[PDB]
Tab-separated table of N, CA and C in Angstrom:
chain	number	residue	atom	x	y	z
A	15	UNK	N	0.807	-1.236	0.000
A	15	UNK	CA	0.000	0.000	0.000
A	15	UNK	C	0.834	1.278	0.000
A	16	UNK	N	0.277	2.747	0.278
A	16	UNK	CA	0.907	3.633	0.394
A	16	UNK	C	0.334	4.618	-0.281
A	17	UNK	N	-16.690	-14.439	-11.571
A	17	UNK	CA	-15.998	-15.010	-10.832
A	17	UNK	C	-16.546	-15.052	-9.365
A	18	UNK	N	-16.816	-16.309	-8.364
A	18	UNK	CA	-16.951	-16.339	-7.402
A	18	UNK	C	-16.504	-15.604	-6.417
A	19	UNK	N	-16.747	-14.826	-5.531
A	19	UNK	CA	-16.149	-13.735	-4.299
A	19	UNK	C	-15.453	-12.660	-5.175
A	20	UNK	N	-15.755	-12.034	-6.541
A	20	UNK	CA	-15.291	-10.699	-7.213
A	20	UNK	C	-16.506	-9.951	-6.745
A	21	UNK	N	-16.228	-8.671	-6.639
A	21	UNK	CA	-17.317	-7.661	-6.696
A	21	UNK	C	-16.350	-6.591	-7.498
A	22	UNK	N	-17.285	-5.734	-8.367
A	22	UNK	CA	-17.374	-4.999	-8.900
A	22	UNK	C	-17.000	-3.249	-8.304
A	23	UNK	N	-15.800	-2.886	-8.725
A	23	UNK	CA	-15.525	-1.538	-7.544
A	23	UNK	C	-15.504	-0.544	-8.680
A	24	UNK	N	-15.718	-0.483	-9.588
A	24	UNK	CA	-15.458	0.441	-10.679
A	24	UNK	C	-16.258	1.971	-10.209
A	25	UNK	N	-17.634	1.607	-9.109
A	25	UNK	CA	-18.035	2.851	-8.253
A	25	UNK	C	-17.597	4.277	-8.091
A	26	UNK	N	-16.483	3.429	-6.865
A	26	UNK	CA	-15.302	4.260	-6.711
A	26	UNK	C	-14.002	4.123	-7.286
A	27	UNK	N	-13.399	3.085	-7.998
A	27	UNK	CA	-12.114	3.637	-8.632
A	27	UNK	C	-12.493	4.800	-9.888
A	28	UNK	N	-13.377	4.439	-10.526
A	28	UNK	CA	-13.922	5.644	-11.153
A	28	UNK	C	-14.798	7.072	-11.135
A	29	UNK	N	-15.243	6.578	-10.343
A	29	UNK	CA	-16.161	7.976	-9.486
A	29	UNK	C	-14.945	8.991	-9.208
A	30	UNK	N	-15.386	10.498	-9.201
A	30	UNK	CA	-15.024	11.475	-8.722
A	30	UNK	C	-14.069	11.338	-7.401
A	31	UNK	N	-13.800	12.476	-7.260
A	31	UNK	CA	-12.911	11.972	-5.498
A	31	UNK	C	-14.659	12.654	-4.964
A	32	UNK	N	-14.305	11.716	-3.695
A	32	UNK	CA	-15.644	12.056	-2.897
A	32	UNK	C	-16.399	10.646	-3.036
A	33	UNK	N	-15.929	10.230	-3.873
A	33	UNK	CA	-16.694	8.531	-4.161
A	33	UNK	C	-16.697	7.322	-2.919
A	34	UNK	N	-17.894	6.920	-2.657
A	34	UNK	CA	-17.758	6.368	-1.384
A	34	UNK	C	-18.541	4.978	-1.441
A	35	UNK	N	-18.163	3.776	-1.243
A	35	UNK	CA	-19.069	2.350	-1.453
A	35	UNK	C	-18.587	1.356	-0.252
A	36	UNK	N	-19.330	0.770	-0.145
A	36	UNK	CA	-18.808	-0.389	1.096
A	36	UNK	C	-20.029	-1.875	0.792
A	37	UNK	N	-18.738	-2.700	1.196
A	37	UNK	CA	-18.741	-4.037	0.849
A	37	UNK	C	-18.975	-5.113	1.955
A	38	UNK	N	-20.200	-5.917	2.115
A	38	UNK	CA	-19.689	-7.215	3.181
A	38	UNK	C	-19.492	-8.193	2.289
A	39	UNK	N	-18.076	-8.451	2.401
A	39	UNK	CA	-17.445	-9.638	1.399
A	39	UNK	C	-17.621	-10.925	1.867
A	40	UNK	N	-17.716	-11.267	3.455
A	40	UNK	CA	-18.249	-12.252	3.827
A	40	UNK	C	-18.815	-12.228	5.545
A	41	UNK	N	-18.872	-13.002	6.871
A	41	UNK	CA	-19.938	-12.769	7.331
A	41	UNK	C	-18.770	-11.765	8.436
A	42	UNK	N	-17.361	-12.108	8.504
A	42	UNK	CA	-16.485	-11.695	8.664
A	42	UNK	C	-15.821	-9.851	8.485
A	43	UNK	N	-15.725	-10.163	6.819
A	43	UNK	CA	-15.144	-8.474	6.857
A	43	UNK	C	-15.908	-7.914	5.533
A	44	UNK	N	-15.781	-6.487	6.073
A	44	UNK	CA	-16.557	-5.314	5.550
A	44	UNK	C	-15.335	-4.398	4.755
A	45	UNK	N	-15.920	-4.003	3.622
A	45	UNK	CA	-14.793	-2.914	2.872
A	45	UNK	C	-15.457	-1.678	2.460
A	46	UNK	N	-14.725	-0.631	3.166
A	46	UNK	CA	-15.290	0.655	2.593
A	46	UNK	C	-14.265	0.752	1.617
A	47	UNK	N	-14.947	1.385	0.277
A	47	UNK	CA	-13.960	2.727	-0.671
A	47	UNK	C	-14.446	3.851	-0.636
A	48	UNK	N	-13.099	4.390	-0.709
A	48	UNK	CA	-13.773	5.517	-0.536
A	48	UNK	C	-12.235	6.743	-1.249
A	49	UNK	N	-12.866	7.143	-2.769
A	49	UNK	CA	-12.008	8.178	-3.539
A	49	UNK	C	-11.542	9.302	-2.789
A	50	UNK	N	-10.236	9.642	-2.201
A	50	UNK	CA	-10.255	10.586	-0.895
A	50	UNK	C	-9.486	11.753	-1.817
A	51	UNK	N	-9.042	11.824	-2.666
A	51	UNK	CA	-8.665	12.529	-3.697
A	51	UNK	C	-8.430	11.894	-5.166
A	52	UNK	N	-7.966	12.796	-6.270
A	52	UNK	CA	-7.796	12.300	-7.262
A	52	UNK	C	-7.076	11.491	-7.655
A	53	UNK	N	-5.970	11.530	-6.479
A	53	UNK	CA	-4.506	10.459	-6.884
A	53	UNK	C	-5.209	8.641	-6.149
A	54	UNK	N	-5.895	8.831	-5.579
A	54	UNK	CA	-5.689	7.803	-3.590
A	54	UNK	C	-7.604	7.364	-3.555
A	55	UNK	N	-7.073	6.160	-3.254
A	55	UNK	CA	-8.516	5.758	-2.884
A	55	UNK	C	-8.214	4.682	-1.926
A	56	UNK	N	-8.598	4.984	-0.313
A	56	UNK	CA	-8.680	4.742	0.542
A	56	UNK	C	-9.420	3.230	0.831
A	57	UNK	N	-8.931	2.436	1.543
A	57	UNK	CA	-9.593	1.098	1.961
A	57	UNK	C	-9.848	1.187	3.393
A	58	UNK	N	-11.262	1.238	3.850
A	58	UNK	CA	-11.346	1.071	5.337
A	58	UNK	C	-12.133	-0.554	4.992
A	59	UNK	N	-11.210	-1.143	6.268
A	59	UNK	CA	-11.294	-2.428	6.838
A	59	UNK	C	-12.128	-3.107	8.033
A	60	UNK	N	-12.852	-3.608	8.109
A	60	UNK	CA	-13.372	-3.922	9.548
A	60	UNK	C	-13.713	-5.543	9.318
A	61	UNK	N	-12.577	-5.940	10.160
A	61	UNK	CA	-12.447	-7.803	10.026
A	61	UNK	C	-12.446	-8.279	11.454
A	62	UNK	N	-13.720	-9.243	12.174
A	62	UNK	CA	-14.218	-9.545	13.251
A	62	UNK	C	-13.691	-10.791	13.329
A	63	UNK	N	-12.998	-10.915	12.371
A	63	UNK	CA	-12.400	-12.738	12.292
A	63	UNK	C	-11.334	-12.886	12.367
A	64	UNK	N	-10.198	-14.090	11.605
A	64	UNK	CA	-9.320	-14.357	11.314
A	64	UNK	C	-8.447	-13.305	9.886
A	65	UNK	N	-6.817	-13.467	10.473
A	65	UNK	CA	-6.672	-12.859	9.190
A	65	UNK	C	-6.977	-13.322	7.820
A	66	UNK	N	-7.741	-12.459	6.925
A	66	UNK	CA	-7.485	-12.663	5.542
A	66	UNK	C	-6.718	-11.825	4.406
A	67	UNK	N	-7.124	-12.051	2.827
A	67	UNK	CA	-6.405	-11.102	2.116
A	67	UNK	C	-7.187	-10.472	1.324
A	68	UNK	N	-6.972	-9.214	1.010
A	68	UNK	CA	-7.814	-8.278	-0.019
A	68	UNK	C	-6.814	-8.545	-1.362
A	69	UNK	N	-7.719	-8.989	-2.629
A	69	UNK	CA	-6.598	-9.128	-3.934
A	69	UNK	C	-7.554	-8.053	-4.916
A	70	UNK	N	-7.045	-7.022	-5.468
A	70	UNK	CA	-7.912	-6.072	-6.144
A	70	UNK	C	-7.124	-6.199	-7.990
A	71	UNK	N	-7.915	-6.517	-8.858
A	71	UNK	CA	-7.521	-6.862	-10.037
A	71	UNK	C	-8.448	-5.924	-10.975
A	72	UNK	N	-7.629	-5.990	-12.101
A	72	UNK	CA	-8.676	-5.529	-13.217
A	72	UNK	C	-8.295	-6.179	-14.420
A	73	UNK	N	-9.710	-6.233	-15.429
A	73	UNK	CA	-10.433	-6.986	-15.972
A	73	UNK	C	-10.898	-6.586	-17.418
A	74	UNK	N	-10.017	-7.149	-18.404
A	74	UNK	CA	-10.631	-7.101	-19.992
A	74	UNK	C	-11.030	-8.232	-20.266
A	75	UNK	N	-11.888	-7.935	-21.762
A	75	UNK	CA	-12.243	-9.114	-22.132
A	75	UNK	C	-11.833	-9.030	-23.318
A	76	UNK	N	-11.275	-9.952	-23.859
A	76	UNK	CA	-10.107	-9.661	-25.502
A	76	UNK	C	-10.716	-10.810	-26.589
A	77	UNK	N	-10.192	-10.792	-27.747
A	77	UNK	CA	-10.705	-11.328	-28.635
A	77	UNK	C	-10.632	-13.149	-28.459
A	78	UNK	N	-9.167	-13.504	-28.253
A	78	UNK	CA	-8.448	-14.446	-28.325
A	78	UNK	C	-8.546	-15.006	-27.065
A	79	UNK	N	-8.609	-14.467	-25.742
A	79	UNK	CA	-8.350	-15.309	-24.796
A	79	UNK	C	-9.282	-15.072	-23.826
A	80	UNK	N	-10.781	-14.655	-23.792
A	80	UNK	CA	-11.452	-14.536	-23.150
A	80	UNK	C	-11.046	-13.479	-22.010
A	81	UNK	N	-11.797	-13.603	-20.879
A	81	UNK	CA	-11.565	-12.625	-19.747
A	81	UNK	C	-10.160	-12.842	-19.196
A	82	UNK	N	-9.459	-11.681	-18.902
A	82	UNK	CA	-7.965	-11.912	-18.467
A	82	UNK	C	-7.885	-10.839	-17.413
A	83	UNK	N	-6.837	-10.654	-16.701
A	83	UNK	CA	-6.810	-9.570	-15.529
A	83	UNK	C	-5.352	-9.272	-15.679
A	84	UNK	N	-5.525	-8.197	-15.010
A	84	UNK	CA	-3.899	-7.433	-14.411
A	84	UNK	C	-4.191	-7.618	-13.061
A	85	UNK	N	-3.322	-7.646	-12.047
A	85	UNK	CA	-2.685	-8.039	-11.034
A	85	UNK	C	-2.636	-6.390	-10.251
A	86	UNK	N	-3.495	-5.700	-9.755
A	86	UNK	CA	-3.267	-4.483	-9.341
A	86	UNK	C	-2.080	-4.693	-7.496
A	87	UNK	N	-2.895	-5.421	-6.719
A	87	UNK	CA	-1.994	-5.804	-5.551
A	87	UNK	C	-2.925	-6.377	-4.502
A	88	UNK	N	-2.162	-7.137	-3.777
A	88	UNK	CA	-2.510	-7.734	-2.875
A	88	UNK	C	-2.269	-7.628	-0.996
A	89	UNK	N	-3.573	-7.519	-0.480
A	89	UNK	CA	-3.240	-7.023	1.102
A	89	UNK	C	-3.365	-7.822	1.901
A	90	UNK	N	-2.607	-8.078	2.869
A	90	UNK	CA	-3.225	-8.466	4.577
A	90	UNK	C	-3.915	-8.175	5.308
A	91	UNK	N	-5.157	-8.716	5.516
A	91	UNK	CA	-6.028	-7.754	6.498
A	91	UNK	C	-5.913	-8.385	7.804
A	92	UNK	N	-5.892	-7.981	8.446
A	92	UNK	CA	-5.356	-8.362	10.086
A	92	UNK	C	-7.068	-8.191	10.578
A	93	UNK	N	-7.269	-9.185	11.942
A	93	UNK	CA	-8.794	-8.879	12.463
A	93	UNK	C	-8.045	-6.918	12.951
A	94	UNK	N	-9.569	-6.607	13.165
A	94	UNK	CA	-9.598	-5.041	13.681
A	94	UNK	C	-10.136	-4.041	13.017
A	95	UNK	N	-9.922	-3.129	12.992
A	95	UNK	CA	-10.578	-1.924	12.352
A	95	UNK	C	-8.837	-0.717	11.664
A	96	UNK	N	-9.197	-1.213	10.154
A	96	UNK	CA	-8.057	-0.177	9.758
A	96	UNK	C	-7.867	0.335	8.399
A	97	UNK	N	-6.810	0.583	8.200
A	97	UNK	CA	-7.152	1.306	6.746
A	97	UNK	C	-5.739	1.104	5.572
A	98	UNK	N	-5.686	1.047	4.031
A	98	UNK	CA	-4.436	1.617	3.802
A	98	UNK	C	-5.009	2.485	2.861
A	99	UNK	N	-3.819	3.131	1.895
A	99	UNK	CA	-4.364	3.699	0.504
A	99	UNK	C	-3.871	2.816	-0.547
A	100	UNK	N	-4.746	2.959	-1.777
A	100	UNK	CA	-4.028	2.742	-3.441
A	100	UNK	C	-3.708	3.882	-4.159
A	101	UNK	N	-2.724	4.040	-4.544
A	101	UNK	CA	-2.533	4.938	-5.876
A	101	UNK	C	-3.395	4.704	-7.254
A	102	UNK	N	-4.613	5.339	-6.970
A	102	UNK	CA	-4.631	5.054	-8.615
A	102	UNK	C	-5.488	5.992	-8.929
A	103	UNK	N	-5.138	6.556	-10.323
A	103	UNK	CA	-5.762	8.062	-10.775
A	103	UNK	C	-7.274	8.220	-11.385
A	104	UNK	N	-7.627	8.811	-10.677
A	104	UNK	CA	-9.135	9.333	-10.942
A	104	UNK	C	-9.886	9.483	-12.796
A	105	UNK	N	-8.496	9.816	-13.220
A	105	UNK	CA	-8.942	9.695	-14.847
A	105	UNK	C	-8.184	8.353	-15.625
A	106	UNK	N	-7.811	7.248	-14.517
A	106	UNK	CA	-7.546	5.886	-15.276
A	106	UNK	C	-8.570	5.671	-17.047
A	107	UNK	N	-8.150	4.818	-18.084
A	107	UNK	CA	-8.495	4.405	-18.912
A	107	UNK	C	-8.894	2.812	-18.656
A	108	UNK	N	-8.395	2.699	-17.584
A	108	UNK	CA	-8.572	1.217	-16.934
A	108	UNK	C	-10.229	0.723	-16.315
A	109	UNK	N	-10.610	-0.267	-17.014
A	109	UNK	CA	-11.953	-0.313	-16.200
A	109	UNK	C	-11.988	-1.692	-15.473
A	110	UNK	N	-13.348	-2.178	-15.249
A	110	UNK	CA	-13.249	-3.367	-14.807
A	110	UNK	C	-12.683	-3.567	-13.244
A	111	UNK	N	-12.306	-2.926	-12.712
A	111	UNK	CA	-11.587	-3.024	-11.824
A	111	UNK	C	-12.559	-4.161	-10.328
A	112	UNK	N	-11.814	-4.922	-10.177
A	112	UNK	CA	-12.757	-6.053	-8.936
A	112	UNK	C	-11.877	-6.148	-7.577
A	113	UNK	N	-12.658	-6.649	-6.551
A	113	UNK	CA	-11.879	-7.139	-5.197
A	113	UNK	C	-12.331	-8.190	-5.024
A	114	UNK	N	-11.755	-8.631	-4.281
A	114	UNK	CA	-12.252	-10.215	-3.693
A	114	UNK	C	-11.313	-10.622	-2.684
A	115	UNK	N	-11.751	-11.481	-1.793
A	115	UNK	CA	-10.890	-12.066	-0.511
A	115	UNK	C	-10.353	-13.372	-1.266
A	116	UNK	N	-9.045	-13.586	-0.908
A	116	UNK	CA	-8.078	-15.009	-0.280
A	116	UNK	C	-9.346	-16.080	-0.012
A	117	UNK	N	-9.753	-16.026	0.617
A	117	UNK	CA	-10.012	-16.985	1.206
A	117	UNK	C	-12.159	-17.157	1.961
């Protein structure tokens, strides 16, 4: 920082800054986004369980090889209440963008 269990975040990686969505990914942990400026879009965390992982990818669909992804990055979420940022710019050309847990 600094498909079964995908959801769809394109909300807020594309929304304006000010963009705000939240997720119960399972019975465990909750994900806010939230666009906190144009560069940064904020992950608040709230995990009542065991640790898991946040994997955030994005998603074309091409002629030749069906649906494929890029590899944006992958987090640790520790139980608790917390947060990191992503770098990624408010006027991306990139769409598709998904999260999903490890596990």
């Amino acid at each position: 920082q600094g498909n079964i269990g995908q959801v769809d975040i394109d909300s807020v990686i594309l929304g304006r800054p000010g963009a705000i969505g939240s997720w119960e990914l399972n019975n465990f942990i909750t994900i806010g986004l939230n666009r906190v400026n144009a560069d940064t879009v904020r992950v608040n965390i709230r995990n009542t369980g065991r640790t898991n992982r946040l994997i955030i990818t994005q998603w074309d669909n091409t002629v030749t090889r069906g649906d494929v992804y890029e590899l944006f990055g992958d987090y640790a979420l520790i139980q608790g209440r917390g947060s990191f940022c992503l770098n990624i710019r408010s006027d991306t050309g990139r769409e598709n963008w998904r999260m999903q847990l490890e596990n």
